[PDB]
Every structure is written in structure tokens, then in C-alpha cells.
């Protein structure tokens, strides 16, 4: 329920800042120790899903509320996404999942459970179909 809540005491602010520092440095260095191939894929995914997230903003929130009001776990979700992937072979459904997962992430504050989800779901999302789409662009 919101963000300002967990930031109760002074310690919590400093502890958050330190934790944010570590995560941002690990991430920036990571980008730098990446091949230009990966780097370009990152560019492709970045504009597509930054667009999807922006164009279908309210559909993201709509799906967020659909996920809330029901007792729903990360795992059953991944499985559903996987079943979808087996028949829907469009690019759209994959991009939309990435953006929806990204929305789920922005709202969770546990970094550990969040990265687990990112990790599990990105496996599922990157089936052979999706990979073929990404490699064949610029």
C-alpha cells in the first residue's frame, strides 16, 4: 500500500538510499560489460515496451486491478503466460507481457521477490518465437 509508508524512520531512508546505490551501480556496470549485440537488443526492447507501456497505460492498470482482487501468485501466472505462448505466436502478446510485468515490478517493494519474478518470467517470455522477432530488427 504505497511507498512513503515503509520509509518510517531515519534509518529506513539511509538504508533505502544505500540499497538503491548498490542496485544502480551493479546495473550500470552491467550495461558497460555487455557486448554491443546485447546492447542493441536492450535498445530495441526499450523503445517497444516504453511505447507499449505508454500507449496501453490504462490497460496495464486495468490488468493490475484484475490481478489484485483475486488470490493470485507469480507461479500460476508464469504458467498461464506459458500456455498463451504455445498458441499465440504474435509479437504483441509478448511485448504486452513484458510491459505488464514491468508494471507489477514498479509497484512491488521487495527487491528480492521482484527480481525472482523478472527472472522467471523473462525465461518464459523469451521463447524461440520472441527471439526470432528481436534478432531480425535493428
Amino acid at each position: 500500500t504505497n511507498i512513503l509508508d515503509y520509509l518510517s524512520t531515519e534509518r529506513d531512508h539511509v538504508m533505502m538510499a544505500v540499497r538503491y546505490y548498490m542496485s544502480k551501480q551493479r546495473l550500470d556496470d552491467l550495461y558497460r560489460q555487455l557486448p554491443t549485440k546485447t546492447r542493441s537488443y536492450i535498445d530495441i526492447i526499450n523503445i517497444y515496451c516504453d511505447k507499449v507501456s505508454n500507449d496501453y497505460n490504462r490497460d496495464m492498470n486495468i490488468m493490475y486491478d484484475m490481478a489484485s482482487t483475486k488470490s493470485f501468485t507469480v507461479y500460476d501466472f508464469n504458467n498461464e503466460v506459458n500456455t498463451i505462448m504455445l498458441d499465440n505466436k504474435g509479437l504483441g502478446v509478448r511485448l504486452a507481457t513484458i510491459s505488464f510485468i514491468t508494471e507489477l515490478g514498479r509497484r512491488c517493494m521487495n527487491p528480492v521477490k521482484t527480481i525472482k519474478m523478472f527472472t522467471l518470467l523473462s525465461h518464459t517470455i523469451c521463447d524461440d518465437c520472441f527471439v526470432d522477432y528481436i534478432t531480425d530488427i535493428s
Partner: peptide, 23 residues
């Protein structure tokens, strides 16, 4: 149950498809 979110996601995806296999 859960495929309500599933359907929604595919629907969005179909819109995304029709919008880049044209102008």
C-alpha cells in the same frame, strides 16, 4: 480464474500486432 488477465494481455497484443503490420 486468472486467464481474465490472460485474455486481456492477448487482446492488447492483437492491438499491438495490427498497429505495426500497417501505418
Amino acid at each position: 480464474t486468472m486467464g481474465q488477465v490472460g485474455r486481456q494481455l492477448k487482446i492488447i497484443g492483437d492491438d499491438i500486432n495490427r498497429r505495426y503490420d500497417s501505418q
